[PDB]
Amino acid sequence: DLKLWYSQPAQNWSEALPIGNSRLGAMVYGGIEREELQLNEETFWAGSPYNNNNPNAVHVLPVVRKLIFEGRNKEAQRLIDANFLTQQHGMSYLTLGSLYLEFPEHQNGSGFYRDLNLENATTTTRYQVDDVTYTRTTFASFTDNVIIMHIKASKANALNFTIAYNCPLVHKVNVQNDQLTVTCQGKEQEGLKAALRAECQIQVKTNGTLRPAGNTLQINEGTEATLYISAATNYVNYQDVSADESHRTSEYLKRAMQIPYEKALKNHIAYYKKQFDRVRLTLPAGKASQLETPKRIENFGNGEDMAMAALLFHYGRYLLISSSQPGGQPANLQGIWNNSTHAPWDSKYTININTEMNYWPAEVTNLSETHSPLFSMLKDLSVTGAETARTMYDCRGWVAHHNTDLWRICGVVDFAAAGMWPSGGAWLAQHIWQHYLFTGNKEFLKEYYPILKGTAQFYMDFLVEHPVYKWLVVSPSVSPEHGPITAGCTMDNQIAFDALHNTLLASYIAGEAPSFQDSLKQTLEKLPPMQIGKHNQLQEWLEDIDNPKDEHRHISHLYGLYPSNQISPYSNPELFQAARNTLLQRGDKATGWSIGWKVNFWARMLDGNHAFQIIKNMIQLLPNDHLAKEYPNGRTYPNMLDAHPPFQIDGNFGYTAGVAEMLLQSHDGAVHLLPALPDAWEEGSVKGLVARGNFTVDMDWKNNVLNKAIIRSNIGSTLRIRSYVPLKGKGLKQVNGKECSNRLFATTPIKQPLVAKGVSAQSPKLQKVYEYDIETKAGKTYIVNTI
Template identity: 55%
Template sequence: MIRATINSLFERCINYKSSRFMMAWLLVGFFLMNNDAKGQDLKLWYNEPAKAWVEALPLGNSRLGAMVYGIPQREELQLNEETIWGGGPYRNDNPNALQALPEAQKLVFEGRTKEADKLVNQNFFTKMHGMPFQTAGSVILKFPGHETNSAYYRELDIDRAVALTRYNVDGVTYTRETFSSFVDNVIIMRITASKKGAVNFDLSYTKPAPFKVSAKNNVLVMEGKGASHEGIDAKIIYQMHSAVKTNDGKVSFTDSTLSVYGATVATLYISIGTNFIDYKTVGADYEKKAAAWLSAAMTKDYASAIKNHAAFYAKQFNRFKLDLGKNVEASKLPTTQRIINYRTTQDPSLVTLLAQFGRYLLISSSQPGGQAANLQGIWCNAMYPPWDSKYTININAEMNYWPAEVTNLSENHQPFIQMVKELSQSGRETAQVMYGADGWTAHHNTDIWRVTGPIDFAAAGMWPTGGAWVSQHLWEHYLYTGDKKYLADVYPAMKGSADFFLSALVKHPANGWMVVSPSVSPEQGPLSAGTTMDNQLVFDILTRTAEANKILGGDAAYRAKLLNMVKKLPPMQIGKHTQLQEWLEDKDDPKNEHRHVSHLYGLYPGDQVSPYTHPKLFEAARNSLVYRGDKATGWSIGWKVNLWARLLDGNHAYTIVNNMLTLAGGNNGDGRTYPNMFTAHPPFQIDGNFGLTAGVAEMILQSHDGAVHLLPAIPDIWKDGSVSGIVARGGFEISMTWKKGEVTEISVVSKLGGNLRLRAYNGLKAANLKPAKGANPNTFFTKPAIADPSVSDQASFKGAGLKTVYEYDLATKAGGRYVIFKK
């Protein structure tokens, strides 16, 4: 409301003849807006410009990303387009693998891992290790005379997906408002001055690679291309088009520059088009695409453009609201200082901001019809970023989508699901050429060209189980939506992954179990057979494909074949340190603090370890996590928040949240959150942001273990709070409040109907709410049986130490709304 009022006043002031009148109103507006900004919980704000990329503010509409520095005299908009990658369509299958496979398996079974490593490196890998995601370049705006300024302020409003920069020069207030439009598919910046005709700037391009610039039809055009890489020729070509509309200024061009002089309001439009068609094809008319988006956007008035953009975004962002409490004094500080002070303030609203910032990033980097968010989402300022900013599918790419369903962003899951469907096609050749197997496979890394052969080296990349992990997302989306038409569409990809393991698993000579070999426990060598994570992933893809087959009325004989293979898989095992073993052999080192905790996939994001039905496995998983320690890289911290939440230990999960909210950059190598709230590996990887968001949600609600568990891992410090629009499997959308750590009121919308089993630490009451009996009849909560092994030293197990729970059943109808209260 305040912002709308100020905008209206500003429009009136621009046309008013009295400059003193105009300045008076603007000072009032500045005061109100500044206080409005500082009082809002969903803003990142700063009192100085960005000095580095990890201080710039991210904008995105899934296709176009921008990092806004907010520098008064030299603004930089560092830009990305989701399909600007190095290389072009290619494959990286090594046909030598098939012949070498039996010998590699023999060496692994015999424990001759060094020889196996050498053989695999020579025969399974190629010189192609994935193509890099790359910057499109930057738009530079030079404002003469703005080096000396005052009253500086900049913000990212994640409630509107708009960045703002404001400052004074010689008594004139300058404001820049920028967004990457979800509706118009261009980036728009509006530059205004409180004094008539005071906007003057020059626009140019820069990029850390060759490019061409020309002026044509009042548009400044940059043409660039992706880079050739590892012997793969560059195939991506693109153009960036920039144009300006002014109300009263002049716009002129040289061959390399667009200049604006004497304007009061100038609106900049930036459009990018590439020749990308799909992962197999390039050749689109990139110039035509860029020109068409630019032309269409410039026909609309600014007020409508920003209103429509914000409305589109709000439909997704506003579904989920979170209140973990507030520290009013702490929240008045700039965001960087809030992060620095967090250890002292324990400001719960900063956790809320970081959690919601993760949702903002997912909305901004993953819309239906677009590419999946990569290792840096869509934000990358280099030609060769760390790890090429590819899709690392042994954890990182999957982690990007952990918050999608539970925080009510189901449609934002679609780009990842589409990527899995594409991998299921490209991976068929890999399965056949390298393993002589049916179905499809992928290893630990891929890129926009959907390569599925192994990447890097044996100790990291010899992992043919990537297809099994990404395929779990196909099933998870179904559990939340109940969409059988969708399930039928993705079933071939699930079946293809299951078929690979039906034909590629081999019998372990020591115990007769069917195992994946050669493989690794990511990303820890040496080469192994039957690692715990592999066994868990294969168990899931086989059982979930069997269940999908049943739901869709598929072939019962095939279903029986899948379930028969499940019986031959190695069970999870508990080792001499009372830990969940990471390998078949009991060789875990309790002093190993490796960032990967791959053997705990079965705890999270899997659902194979339950405190209620698998207490020994549950305790063993807990011991393994304790051994790994609480500190890690950013993404690993994100995983550990979720794992401790699944262990129902909210206070320990909160300890891990604290480890994330430490300032990264400068000399602080242990910091895990940059000033712009990007999380740090270091360097920046976006998966830490998404993992943290999912972890906070997992502390508040869980729905994997036969019931919808309310506040399963709420820490003592979040004693009072509320959430709305959080989603449980089975299609239940839940809103609730809590006081002193106990649920006080719950509102449930049942999208699919069926039995709702609620689990809580306090009693509940409502009409038709009955004490739960027997197994949950809701098929979305049905799980296959998992053995809970015995251990030699039972005295070492202290038990889960679980709180008493109350369980209730409520019969629901599709579309029904139900209100439940504390007893």
């Protein structure tokens, strides 16, 4: 059960299958008389180097702030829209075009089968024409940095086809020396000129004959043919476009063709398997699980295909591996897969939930390497966003708002109502802190500390005293993406808290001046506390203005519940219950990404049954975008890709991290085994998850109860297990009272929440937990059993 298969070739982009090696991507249709591979390279975007800083903002910031405190929010907003933005609002990721293979004589094909196999990161297309069988194997090589397509007829000399290319961009195609060569111009956008070019080269190994035919390349009388597809651009970094794209493309191709095909395949599969075989979720199958995958998606609701949930979980891991690898660019709104020259929201990096969600799987699902391209981006933003901080706000450190792109802009995007939100940089930076919590790597933390610290330094210079309540607050900002431009947003308070407090914790490891550490504490102590309001809800703003029917897709004020660690049912039961009520008020549906966050939310609520209800709200078929009005509840394409709609990859990755959080939590402050297992999943296993403190964890269960767990300690120190059932095992002390000495999965104290006048704050219903301690040694493995 690790393949997606189909009995008809793709009729549209939502039916085609994604492959990629992080840099090159293809979407594969499977068409019989004509195959299409629509291509992408991760650095092919519109525009040039630029920024969207508006220096007018520094002159106007005090006046904007005065008005907000006077309740004149519209006037402040009109002032923001005129002085804080430019004419450029993030450049669009682009398509690289489509390669077509034309099989004119393959008229009446039968016995058709298409798949994508997650075991080995290859797609297969197979069919009969008369007595002859045809088989296509396609993959984007992790080892040879080219896309490869291998085609085999089962009869001698029976293979004849043409290779051609098209693209919506301005392009040239030339056939010389049996090599098809494409050059592709980048694109002008919002008045910014095009500095990028792409090149693509195709060659073919075959026992048949090769010859040109206009701007196509024709193969005749073959038995096997093997296409080698290379491409690259002139991008080096955000302010350097001087590389030679032709040389780059030639070099990849030359090198890839030195290896024979069977070995090149083996190698690819091996390299992929190192990252992919680390983790498996197993849930029981039925006969239903054998059906083709669009049917599995459609019928998931009826309960007879629990294993499908596991398949979608594995798909997220495949996608992250296939879209994000060390040395490259981070996964954008669409991963690396996009066929437009003006995509939805420019297939950019949206950093008020979206880009962060993409990387939730990285640590917990055992894909730590996939995280690197993001840290790499953070170095860039720590420079370009220091320019933003200085020019616009006259502040030290660095900042980013709610969107950035290949050129690493950090200013205010689109318009104030959604864009005036200076906490994007600070949230992204927390991915540094989490990488440390999960790996324990102190060397990493010291390298990246200046960057993390930079966000804390910005807040210390940007925060201002609220005239009435005296708390330090972030203004002007919004709770993404609704309500007015305002001051004391709960989300900004939670992110500022993490920025300051985790900079502090890191400072004891990195080394710092006592005076800078005392600033951090003095600043934390002045931040606003969280609040329970008149509907027993957690307040999104300072004032008690939450609307209990509002089902807005964003729930930005539960950042603290997830992905942060500020709402614990043990430390703060009353607040936890207010979060619960907030979640009931927002409801279970909305966009694909919204649904993905909610699986994590309900996992942190320790409510497996509700989490599984969210899962059922994602696994519903949207056949394609042409039929969205007719299928308005569909959130998964026949691709198994997530639908906002349209296609947005956030939800695939949010879902995967969600299933993990259902089975394992390590943030508060113990390693919690099966914290949110649905009654639906009566029996199964999971292998390979990671807990903070760098523990790898395997678990299996029967009758809705943990049976056995196997925990490897990758770096030693104390392990604290937490469970709903009592446990036994070698060297397992029970513990009551004193907290654990391991800081990595430890939680952190928040300010006492305030309760509104005449509210009697409800208390949550919690299962009794049993906690145990183990003293562990790096490299060793410990087994735990149930009583």
